[PDB]
Nucleic acid binder design. Structure first.
Ligand SMILES: [Mg+2]
Ligand SMILES: [Mg+2]
Ligand SMILES: [Mg+2]
Ligand SMILES: [Mg+2]
Ligand SMILES: [Mg+2]
Ligand SMILES: [Mg+2]
Ligand SMILES: [Mg+2]
Ligand SMILES: [Mg+2]
Ligand SMILES: [Mg+2]
Ligand SMILES: [Mg+2]
Ligand SMILES: [Mg+2]
Ligand SMILES: [Mg+2]
Ligand SMILES: [Mg+2]
Ligand SMILES: [Mg+2]
Ligand SMILES: [Mg+2]
Ligand SMILES: [Mg+2]
Ligand SMILES: [Mg+2]
Ligand SMILES: [Mg+2]
Ligand SMILES: [Mg+2]
Ligand SMILES: [Mg+2]
Ligand SMILES: [Mg+2]
Ligand SMILES: [Mg+2]
Ligand SMILES: [Mg+2]
Ligand SMILES: [Mg+2]
Ligand SMILES: [Mg+2]
Ligand SMILES: [Mg+2]
Ligand SMILES: [Mg+2]
Ligand SMILES: [Mg+2]
Ligand SMILES: [Mg+2]
Ligand SMILES: [Mg+2]
Ligand SMILES: [Mg+2]
Ligand SMILES: [Mg+2]
Ligand SMILES: [Mg+2]
Ligand SMILES: [Mg+2]
Ligand SMILES: [Mg+2]
Ligand SMILES: [Mg+2]
Ligand SMILES: [Mg+2]
Ligand SMILES: [Mg+2]
Ligand SMILES: [Mg+2]
Ligand SMILES: [Mg+2]
Ligand SMILES: [Mg+2]
Ligand SMILES: [Mg+2]
Ligand SMILES: [Mg+2]
Ligand SMILES: [Mg+2]
Ligand SMILES: [Mg+2]
Ligand SMILES: [Mg+2]
Ligand SMILES: [Mg+2]
Ligand SMILES: [Mg+2]
Ligand SMILES: [Mg+2]
Ligand SMILES: [Mg+2]
Ligand SMILES: [Mg+2]
Ligand SMILES: [Mg+2]
Ligand SMILES: [Mg+2]
Ligand SMILES: [Mg+2]
Ligand SMILES: [Mg+2]
Ligand SMILES: [Mg+2]
Ligand SMILES: [Mg+2]
Ligand SMILES: [Mg+2]
Ligand SMILES: [Mg+2]
Ligand SMILES: [Mg+2]
Ligand SMILES: [Mg+2]
Ligand SMILES: [Mg+2]
Ligand SMILES: [Mg+2]
Ligand SMILES: [Mg+2]
Ligand SMILES: [Mg+2]
Lengths: 210, 147
RNA sequence: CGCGACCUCAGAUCAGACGUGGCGACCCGCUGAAUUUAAGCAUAUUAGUCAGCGGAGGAGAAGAAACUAACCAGGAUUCCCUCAGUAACGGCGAGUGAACAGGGAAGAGCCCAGCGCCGAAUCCCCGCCCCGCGGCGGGGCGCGGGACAUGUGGCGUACGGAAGACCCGCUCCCCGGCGCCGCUCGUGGGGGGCCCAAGUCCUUCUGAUCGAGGCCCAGCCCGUGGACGGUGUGAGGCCGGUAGCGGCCCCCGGCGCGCCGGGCCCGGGUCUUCCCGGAGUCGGGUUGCUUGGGAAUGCAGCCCAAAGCGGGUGGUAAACUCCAUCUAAGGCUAAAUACCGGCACGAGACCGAUAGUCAACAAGUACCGUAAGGGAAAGUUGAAAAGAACUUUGAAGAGAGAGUUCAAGAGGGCGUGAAACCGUUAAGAGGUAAACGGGUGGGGUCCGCGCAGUCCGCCCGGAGGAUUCAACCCGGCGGCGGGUCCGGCCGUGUCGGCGGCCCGGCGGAUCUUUCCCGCGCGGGGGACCGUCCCCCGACCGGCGACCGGCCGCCGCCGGGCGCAUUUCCA
RNA sequence: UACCCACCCGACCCGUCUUGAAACACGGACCAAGGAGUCUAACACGUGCGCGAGUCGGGGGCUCGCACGAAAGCCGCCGUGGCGCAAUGAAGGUGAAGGCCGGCGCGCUCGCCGGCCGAGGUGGGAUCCCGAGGCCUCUCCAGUCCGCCGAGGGCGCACCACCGGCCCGUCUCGCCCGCCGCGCCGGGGAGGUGGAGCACGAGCGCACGUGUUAGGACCCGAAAGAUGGUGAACUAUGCCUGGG
RNA sequence: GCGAAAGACUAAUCGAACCAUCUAGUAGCUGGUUCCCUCCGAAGUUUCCCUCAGGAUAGCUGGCGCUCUCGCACACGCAGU
RNA sequence: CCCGGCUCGCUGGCGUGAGCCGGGCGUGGAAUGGAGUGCCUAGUGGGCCACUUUUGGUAAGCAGAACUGGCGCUGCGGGAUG
RNA sequence: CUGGAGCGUCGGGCCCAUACCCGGCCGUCGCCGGCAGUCGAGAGUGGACGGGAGCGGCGGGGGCGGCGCGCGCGCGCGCCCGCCCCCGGAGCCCCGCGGACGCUACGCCGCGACGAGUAGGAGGGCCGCUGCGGUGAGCCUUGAAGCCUAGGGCGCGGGCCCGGGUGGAGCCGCCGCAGGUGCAGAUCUUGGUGGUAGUAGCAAAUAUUCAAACGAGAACUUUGAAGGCCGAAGUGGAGAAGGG
RNA sequence: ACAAAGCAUCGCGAAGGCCCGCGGCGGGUGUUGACGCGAUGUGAUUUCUGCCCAGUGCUCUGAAUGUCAAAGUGAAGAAAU
RNA sequence: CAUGAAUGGAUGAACGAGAUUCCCACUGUCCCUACCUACUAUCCAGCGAAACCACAGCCAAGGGAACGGGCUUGGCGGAAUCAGCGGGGAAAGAAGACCCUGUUGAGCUUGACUCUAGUCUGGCACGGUGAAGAGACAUGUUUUUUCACUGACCCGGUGAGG
RNA sequence: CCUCACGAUCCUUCUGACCUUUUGGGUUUUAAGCAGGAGGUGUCAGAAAAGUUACCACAGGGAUAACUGGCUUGUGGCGGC
RNA sequence: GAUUGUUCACCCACUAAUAGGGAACGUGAGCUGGGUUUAGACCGUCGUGAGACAGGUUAGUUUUACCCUACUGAUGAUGUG
């Protein structure tokens, strides 16, 4: 029974919230259950980036979100034959392989290749055995470190480049940026209809001829 | 807390702030937003006008990401960029005009509210207003589009 | 009118396996209301919920896209935040009512069938030995069986793979044993056992102390230990304990070297030839349930039923038509993730025995119902039974003495021990039932007193009696206040130093890649502004921020002052 | 003041429903103990505190065997987002800005170009500022200081009333167009009206009060409905087998 | 279910058993609703209601407030006049 | 109130009319009392009685309005009682 | 009750409410209240400081008067000239040099004014219950909680405080925080207890009596004797199911 | 009252009547066959059983030019159609 | 008002704890009552319960929730009790069974609304073989009538015996 | 000539604009909007709805009846002028 | 007294009269239960039916006093040594 100005309210408690309520007095003991994993996993895999394997730079999808960047799932395949890394080797070398990405542009390809090129260079391949041959990095580059990378390997920060102030040529200063949007949005509006008339008018030039 | 309630002050108080003529019975009206057409009408019609009925057109499955488009007013661009980049210029003598990626500060569209300081600018944005156009032009400086 | 292969199918108490019930919080299939809600009401909702039923495990399901998307794109599952209580559904009403993007926990990927390649390269069960035997396994050797040609092994599976040619570089894993070396985080992995400080010091309370003063620093000791419980009251010290990379002894766990027995010729990169998707399935028509899915989201029955530059999808039917994105009909999987059942623990702003679970105890007990089922009440002596020996009355139950007890006015349903209620003793009342309000009066039990309550406190005058002073200086000590801001230290506002600026940092999408390092970007350095420090100089609030001298005053201590003073007493 | 008693005046038994109860209405022998507005979500206003065009809070992380600890601390997290920072339209989308001056286009209350000022005005508006004139002051005059009074005049927040203005929708009307393109293209005016709009901001976070719902819902209080089960030991029938 | 028929009987139960659960079922309807004091202090009136035992909104009430005036020799406003 | 002046696309031989700017001019019947305006919001929404007015009814302690006054809601002196 | 205690019209006089007056006391609202250390009662300024001078003055209204006058200016002293001096002292009703005892600055004080209440609100509760963080060199075996008291008191009162006994182990005060928070009622729940009341009642089958035994105790047991009943379709003698 | 005996209708030749069941090729009548089974009506004996097929039922080798789905076939279209 | 034919009409021998009516005999049914017995009650020994109770309990009238015990005015009142008694305590028992209302039900009914099991019919599906022959459209297709067949399918019997 | 003489939501239709959506683009159908008109709720602010219960039930009700009682006295009875 | 559940009536009869009324329409823990007015039944009519009918008819459980009071009796009571 409402009385004099409120909202309507469709609170959804007609069902049976009561039985299926989860309270959260786990929350802090869970925090700790978790702690001990983060903790244990690291001490188990001693020299290995604690965070996890290396994971690619990647762009967020839908239109609003565009300008952001992420750790993606894993680096593409096309990406690797280019960096010269075999896909099944990568998986052993702490390089994250999604094999399910349609690579569309050279911009985000080489951007993401440089991460592998970077990785190779600052990676100490700890050799199969102690008395081991090629590709494993030398006993100097080996003593120096026992270093787990705390935090995400080569963390991906959204970084922009400053544009210095300009002069504004009398040409940037003529472009009516509103008008040209309305143009755009009407040519894209009617591109299709306009094409039907060229198709009819091209029909009349043949139909007038016969 | 319990202590600071009226129910404390309503002991020995028989009906309990609730009236002994018509008692506090369970659910006199109905249950919740119930009787909107019938008999609770006078609220709904005088206090929430335009509740009962359809209008408009479905857009069904709908996603906001598709039509994400924040707004900024000219009013405050001379915030977005560190105030020193304005004090630098307004001065400088070359007609520098700093660039303002209304993109980079987080806005898919720029709109013509407020004064703008007499100061040439390059605003790179998405969907400009007209008036935003005119004000920036009429100040000096330009309107660059971004995709 | 035979014998023999196979195919189908029987029988065996055959040889060897295994399945079935329970548990059931969490887990998965299905099934499935009505109260209820809508102020009725059937639509709707409760709600795919309860019951019913089926099924699993230490978690369950799912899972490597026939996805997402419309970006400049992402990239198995689940979970938490978030979207978001939003897109839509609805006698568009009660309600209902998701998803896509981002962030984060965790994060691992993989396997079949077919096409083909490879003397079935396979697999199963016997017998003899060699090791191994408290999760039955390797090694060998056997014209010892059998499946399998209607098809068993390897590579391979779409993210390409096979096969070829020449381009490059070069050879360690697996498993059965059999040893041994480092006990391998709470801060020596799990478990058990066993173990590790300091007062019953004085005095005094008390039935008993654990209590109160004291005891070489709040007393004595200890204190990586002062949690807790026990201990005839409140105890760090008495005792168990507690703390404490404290000790030692078994066992169990896990990981490191050797030996051995077996298994394995397993790479990388280039050019060509070809080779490919899982049918009564997709899809459609229909109906039925479902959601939110919609002119059909999901699931169903039936009917119809495909293709191979195909198929699905790309969320209002449809044709055409353009674009994107997966690849079904086969399959597995840790991790986060769930847990009112179990075992095992830890805690609490909890309840505290008509509360707290039905249940503090013979509690799911007594009892009830034929049965499904229903289903209670009931904790406490004291510290110790020291629980009345013995005399006596009484057939005996009960008493009186006595005895025990700190206490029996703690006596075996015993701490305390209310009210209704009843037991008798004392006082007073009593024909309008009692009971009540206002006002007095009499009487009692008590309570104040007084064997004068004359209540106290100043000051003063008088008369008695008694100590050292007060007033004064001088020595000392300690305050206070004053200022000269005198001298110094301090900070507020201003100015100067451009002096910290690089020996002052941090912030800024400020600027230079004239710089340096690493790969146009990242890191670093260098320039700039805003900020915060030194030097000194000047003004001013000169501020509770002092500290030194000079002053003025007060107080205390010690000297002086012996008595018309200055106290005490009556 | 309390116990008994005495008197004088007063005087119906509470609770409740009730226009009206001492009710010839109902509950109520007496006493002990138990006992009824609770929690959560969502709003809303009121208020308290933090910060403020921000502000948060988680959920996550980093910091514990917790004794205190399932605490506290901290995080380009700190904003991936909510809320707010702008509305309006069914939707494609548009989007809060005006004044003035000069110049140029015939100022055609139409178009454009340079400068100046920037949220228009009126009336109320706490009100701050100015203030003519008093009003003393031991003498006559002179005069600086100092307050009190002060007619009259100025700025004027907050707020209220009004008049103006700008955004979006819709209408009407009517002008000129730009021209990456061609206008069944886009674009610009005037007037009116609809808008939960802008017109130099007030939210955010966290408390608490009240209230309103959703919730069992202040407690107690049905006749019913549903789902599963147990019963013919009574009786009703049938049957089987016995007895009179 | 069973009834030579009477709504008979189904274990003290029948216009259709008992047991447990859904189950805090729902109730515009009975009953009750627990400490003091201070201040203000009703309505049974309005329109719609499948409304007449109830709601919806009119009232009246309180609280919370705020804008001001000036009783500070120096007030406008309001009003069962 | 009273002067002056401006604006208009409405209205008209001109003026009206309306709107503005600028100036000029104060207690305008009695009596009373400080005024204004914004949120939340409970109970309530069966009422009853009296004077006077009045409709049904014959009349009622009957039925239904007006107006005012009560009681409810609130005792007290009186109205013996109420 | 009767030339009335009847009824008309009229006097005086008196009686009494919670009504009015005055006073007393306890509430609340307001006072743009005073009171956080100052002069001053239709308050009608105060003060420098100069030049000049002095008994001047300000030689204004039956106003009856208000704003100016008869306690002084100048004066007494120092001797026509100086002064007109310092509270660490004027000696103080004004004191501005520093301020209550009083000033818990949400304290206290004076004015006035006002304080019918159901439902409801609101406020105030050193009103009450239980829990925790603080804090009270709290209290306690020299006796706590409860309990009991015709033991003194206090608040308006929630309650609170004090006197004794018994009890035997723990308890409270303030500042905060936290509640499952205060009962007379619900044919409320549980347990107990009255009145009724020593009341209803121990009535179906005709039936007992005597003696002895045993025994503390005998109408009730047993034995004997006597009277009786069931009366073989039984109260006779055996079984089923059930019972165990 | 019911039943009852007696009278009366009615369906049924088993791929059936009537009937059960959730389901099967499930089951009872049915170890049946019209002198039986199932469904009704009235109520011994005697005498009698009048008219009405206008309604609603029931039913009938009955026309079904009345209509009428799915599917089915006809057409336009580019397809839903 | 308002009978009546298997919703059977009309009769009727026997029988009915079936409904009436009248008569003889009989009778404490009555005039109108009377007595006698047994068990009680009653009194005692022993044992001893319940129902109910706000407080309670002498009346008239007034008023008064319009018939009170209370209260006003009156009337008046002596302790504690026993057997009786049914005038009163609207006595108790038992939130009225009569009646209204509720958006509270149940049982039944049908011409209520909305649906259902079931059955009838049509379509589609398992769902074939052969044979004749016909029409309609068209200049093969469709519709297919009729009659066989037995392999599905169905029922029959037995110890599956020709 | 004035005062009545008509009606929400949801639903349906017709009309209107070179209107908007129909969503990965485009063209045509188709569908949804937007804005006006019509279908209609007679209980008129708008429920898609028959009975009976003497077999009955529960919440309630002196707000609703049947007795008793009050008032009233039409009628009745009784009595005057 | 006859009839009648009856109140109400009418008649016979006697007398002296066969007046009228009240007390919760006096009087169910005084009775009876004849009639109303449950549940079983029957006819009439109405209803399509369940069923309805101040339309008839037959069968249909009638509690509890001990409690205070009134009254009837019975003991008694303070007072009079
Ligand atoms: Mg991670
Ligand atoms: Mg109240
Ligand atoms: Mg109440
Ligand atoms: Mg199992
Ligand atoms: Mg309801
Ligand atoms: Mg409902
Ligand atoms: Mg209902
Ligand atoms: Mg439904
Ligand atoms: Mg559902
Ligand atoms: Mg749902
Ligand atoms: Mg279940
Ligand atoms: Mg995903
Ligand atoms: Mg200890
Ligand atoms: Mg101890
Ligand atoms: Mg020890
Ligand atoms: Mg499928
Ligand atoms: Mg559904
Ligand atoms: Mg798959
Ligand atoms: Mg799986
Ligand atoms: Mg699994
Ligand atoms: Mg107990
Ligand atoms: Mg218990
Ligand atoms: Mg006890
Ligand atoms: Mg006890
Ligand atoms: Mg003792
Ligand atoms: Mg004791
Ligand atoms: Mg003890
Ligand atoms: Mg005791
Ligand atoms: Mg006593
Ligand atoms: Mg005595
Ligand atoms: Mg009521
Ligand atoms: Mg009465
Ligand atoms: Mg009642
Ligand atoms: Mg939101
Ligand atoms: Mg139902
Ligand atoms: Mg019947
Ligand atoms: Mg009411
Ligand atoms: Mg009335
Ligand atoms: Mg009051
Ligand atoms: Mg609690
Ligand atoms: Mg209590
Ligand atoms: Mg005999
Ligand atoms: Mg025997
Ligand atoms: Mg017949
Ligand atoms: Mg006939
Ligand atoms: Mg016919
Ligand atoms: Mg009676
Ligand atoms: Mg109603
Ligand atoms: Mg019903
Ligand atoms: Mg029908
Ligand atoms: Mg005309
Ligand atoms: Mg589409
Ligand atoms: Mg398409
Ligand atoms: Mg009947
Ligand atoms: Mg009444
Ligand atoms: Mg009444
Ligand atoms: Mg009457
Ligand atoms: Mg007679
Ligand atoms: Mg009577
Ligand atoms: Mg009776
Ligand atoms: Mg009687
Ligand atoms: Mg009778
Ligand atoms: Mg009957
Ligand atoms: Mg008949
Ligand atoms: Mg008939």
């Amino acid at each position: 029974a409402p009385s004099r100005n409120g909202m309507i309210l469709k609170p959804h408690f007609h069902k049976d919230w009561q039985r299926r309520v989860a309270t959260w007095f786990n929350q802090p003991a869970r925090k700790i259950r978790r702690r001990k994993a983060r903790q244990a996993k690291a001490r188990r895999i001693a020299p290995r980036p604690a965070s996890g394997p290396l994971r690619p730079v990647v762009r967020c999808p839908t239109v609003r979100y565009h300008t952001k960047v992420r750790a993606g799932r894993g680096f593409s395949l096309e990406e690797l034959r280019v960096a010269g890394i075999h896909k099944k080797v990568a998986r052993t070398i702490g390089i994250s392989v999604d094999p399910r990405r349609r690579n569309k542009c050279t911009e985000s390809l080489q951007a993401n290749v440089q991460r592998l090129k970077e990785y190779r260079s600052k990676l100490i391949l700890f050799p199969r055995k102690p008395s081991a041959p090629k590709k494993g990095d030398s006993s100097a580059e080996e003593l120096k470190l026992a270093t787990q990378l705390t935090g995400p390997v080569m963390p991906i920060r959204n970084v922009y480049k400053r544009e210095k102030a300009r002069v504004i040529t009398d040409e940037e200063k003529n472009f009516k940026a509103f008008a040209s949007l309305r143009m755009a949005r009407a040519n894209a509006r009617l591109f299709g209809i306009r094409a039907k008339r060229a198709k009819e008018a091209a029909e009349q030039d043949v139909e007038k001829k016969k | 807390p319990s202590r600071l309630r009226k129910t404390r002050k309503l002991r020995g108080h028989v009906s309990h702030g609730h009236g002994r003529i018509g008692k506090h019975r369970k659910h006199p009206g109905g249950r919740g937003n119930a009787g909107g057409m019938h008999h609770h009408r006078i609220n709904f019609d005088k206090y929430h006008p335009g509740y009962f009925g359809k209008v408009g057109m479905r857009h069904y499955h709908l996603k906001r990401n598709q039509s994400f488009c924040p707004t900024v007013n000219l009013d405050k661009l001379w915030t977005l960029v560190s105030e020193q980049t304005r004090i630098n210029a307004a001065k400088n003598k070359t007609g520098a005009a700093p660039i303002i990626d209304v993109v980079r500060s987080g806005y898919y569209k720029v709109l013509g509210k407020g004064k703008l300081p007499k100061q040439p600018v390059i605003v790179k944005a998405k969907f400009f207003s007209r008036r935003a156009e005119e004000k920036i032009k009429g100040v000096g400086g330009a309107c660059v589009l971004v995709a």
